[PDB]
């Protein structure tokens, strides 16, 4: 057996019992792997508070530390949860509010509340705390929000530094909206604490200028033979105007045994970018039932 019983040390009311009733079967992270636990560990909003600015990186950075547990029972004196062993077959139910269709053989990952904090935050005023829920999302949107959230903290720094640099109307539609198939979604990023979202960006600038120093020249010369000759379906970002810097590296001649040592070294820094685009734990779903919304996955953290 494995379980977690969580006390409600004061009481709870009849409105927030019906609020915790609709949120049954949802994964929350909690603090410690003890059988007994109080209310202060279960919130993801112990770091995501209302009077302070949230930090969506540091909130997400907090999420790969915690143990993750599924609710079973809501009682007026307690909350009995079941936990998740680090190599365990288990069941997860698709309760989560932006409905994205799963299937068997998908690839889940746990994300902070990034579209509506007010939906995830339900407040427990009888104890002086609010319990905040994450959202489990397939990794095609798990990565694509982290691609978009870091683009915001690049260009919001430019516009807040000098508003003449960036036009504001094109800033809002491009840096906040997440492009998905069929639908575009508006992130809940308006008043944040970007101080740990820049340390991630201060780690890209070490890996990225190394990747600019040792570009293999044969791949540069294939661009100049492709951006102005042929019309390929995914090069159409690059129009007939090639970037001028690419042509200014063409001044040297090709050399195969000096681009093997550039293809190899660039290869081992591409393997390093899986330390900066990390999601939380992973849930390999191997069965799904669409009329019950019940996935049965395999938990493996890190």
């Amino acid at each position: 057996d494995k379980s977690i019983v969580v006390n409600l040390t004061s009481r709870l009311f009849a409105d927030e019992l019906a609020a915790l009733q609709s949120k049954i079967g949802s994964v929350l992270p909690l603090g410690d792997c003890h059988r007994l636990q109080n209310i202060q560990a279960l919130g993801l909003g112990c770091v995501c508070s209302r009077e302070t600015s949230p930090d969506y990186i540091q909130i997400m950075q907090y999420l790969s530390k915690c143990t993750l547990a599924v609710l079973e029972e809501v009682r007026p004196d307690s909350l009995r949860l079941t936990r998740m062993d680090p190599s365990d077959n288990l069941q997860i139910k698709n309760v989560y509010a932006p409905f994205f269709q799963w299937d068997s053989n998908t690839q889940l990952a746990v994300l902070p509340p990034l579209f509506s904090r007010k939906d995830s935050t339900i407040v427990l005023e009888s104890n002086g705390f609010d319990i905040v829920f994450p959202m489990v999302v397939p990794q095609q949107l798990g990565h694509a929000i982290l691609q978009q959230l870091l683009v915001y903290h690049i260009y919001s720094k430019i516009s807040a530094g000098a508003p003449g640099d960036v036009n504001m109307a094109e800033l809002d539609l491009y840096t906040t909206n997440v492009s998905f198939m069929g639908r575009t979604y508006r992130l809940d990023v308006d008043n944040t604490d970007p101080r740990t979202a820049l340390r991630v960006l201060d780690d890209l600038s070490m890996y990225l200028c190394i990747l600019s120093a040792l570009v293999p020249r044969g791949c540069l010369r294939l661009l100049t033979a492709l951006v102005r000759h042929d019309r390929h379906p995914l090069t159409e970002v690059f129009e007939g105007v090639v970037p001028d810097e690419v042509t200014r590296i063409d001044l040297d001649q090709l050399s195969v045994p000096d681009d093997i040592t550039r293809m190899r070294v660039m290869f081992s820094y591409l393997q390093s970018l899986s330390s900066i685009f990390n999601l939380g734990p992973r849930l390999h779903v191997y069965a799904y039932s669409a009329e019950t919304l019940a996935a049965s996955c395999w938990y493996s953290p890190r």
Partner: protein, 344 residues
């Protein structure tokens, strides 16, 4: 002194020359520049005898701790068509990201251009360095009269001096082309007050209430409110400022308010935005103005007047007591191009 060599790599290729400038505390005390590390500088130049606007570039500034001592910067100089102009203002705008701070510091090119006058493949590793020695040459600012230093770093170079292209006849006098801004804004203020006085004549030299404020019954108070209007006409005419409220309203894409200090009892705070208030002129829209904390004190109190500028370039002069006069800034289509270029 690192702040010079950082800008030669990142501001450098986006410019023509950099004016490496170190500002001593005597220059800092006059302009009141509080040296916190959060300050984000920004530079753009205001051209003369050409369409006047260049791009805004963010410039790094670091305090130098001790042979001078003060804030270190680097000003961009723009050579359109291969040469510099002598009368061409390089504007520095100083602001904090969180708090409320906006300063404008302006430099002219003749105080800058004159001061400049005296097998495995190896990868190149070019770090930022303070190896290059500085030569410190004196300069004085034209606009305030406070000395600042200019660095000339060691590198068709020694053969030529730095180019200038002096203005040609016919020309306005160079004390009037230097202050091109303070003679255009002043004549928009002197023509604004002539609309405020014109509304007295069409009413019969009267001041009517607009805001419901009870006035205590004394004959010396009713003569004192009239003295706030005539003092406000001495202050609005003398005011020739870069950051007035009507310039913020003309370059807007919201009511723009600026309170005054009558009889020099207060310095001016200009360009305050009235967010959430639509100055339609209806009586239900003056309650949203009275919910601002400034207009409760410009009206109940004394010695402060207040101007509220609509986006349609119509402005009221709000006096203590609720008395107000609708006035109008007249800006033609030729002058909106002149303002939204150099300022917006």
């Amino acid at each position: 002194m690192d702040a010079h060599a950082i800008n030669e790599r990142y501001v450098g290729p986006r410019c023509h020359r950099l004016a490496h400038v170190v500002l001593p505390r005597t220059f800092l005390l006059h302009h009141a520049i509080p040296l916190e590390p959060e300050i984000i500088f920004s530079t753009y130049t205001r051209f003369s005898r050409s369409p006047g606007s260049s791009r805004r570039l963010v410039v790094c500034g670091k305090r130098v701790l001790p042979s001078p001592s003060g804030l270190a910067l680097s000003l961009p100089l723009f050579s359109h068509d291969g040469n510099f102009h002598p009368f061409d203002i390089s504007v520095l705008r100083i602001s904090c990201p969180g708090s409320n701070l906006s300063l404008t510091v302006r430099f002219l090119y003749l105080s800058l251009v004159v001061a400049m006058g005296a097998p495995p493949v190896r990868l190149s590793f070019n770090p930022v360095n303070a190896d290059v020695p500085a030569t410190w040459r004196d300069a004085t600012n034209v606009y305030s009269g406070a000395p600042y230093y200019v660095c000339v770093y060691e590198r068709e170079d020694d053969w030529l001096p730095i180019p200038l292209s002096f203005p040609e006849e016919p020309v306005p006098p160079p004390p009037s082309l230097v202050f091109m801004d303070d003679l255009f804004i002043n004549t928009k203020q002197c023509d604004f007050v002539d609309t405020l006085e014109a509304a007295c004549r069409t009413q019969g030299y009267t001041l009517r209430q607009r805001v419901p404020v009870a006035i205590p019954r004394d004959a010396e108070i009713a003569d004192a409110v009239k003295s706030h209007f005539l003092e406000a006409c001495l202050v609005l005419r003398g005011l020739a400022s870069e950051a007035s409220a009507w310039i913020r309203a003309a370059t807007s894409p919201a009511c723009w308010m600026d309170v005054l200090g009558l009889w020099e009892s207060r310095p001016h705070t200009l360009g305050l935005e009235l967010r959430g208030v639509n100055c339609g002129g209806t009586d239900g829209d003056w309650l949203e103005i009275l919910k601002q904390p400034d207009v409760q004190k410009t009206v109940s109190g004394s010695l402060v007047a207040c101007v509220i500028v609509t986006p349609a370039l119509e402005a009221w002069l709000v006096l203590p007591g609720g008395f107000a006069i609708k006035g109008r800034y007249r800006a033609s289509k030729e002058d909106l191009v002149f303002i939204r270029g150099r300022y917006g």
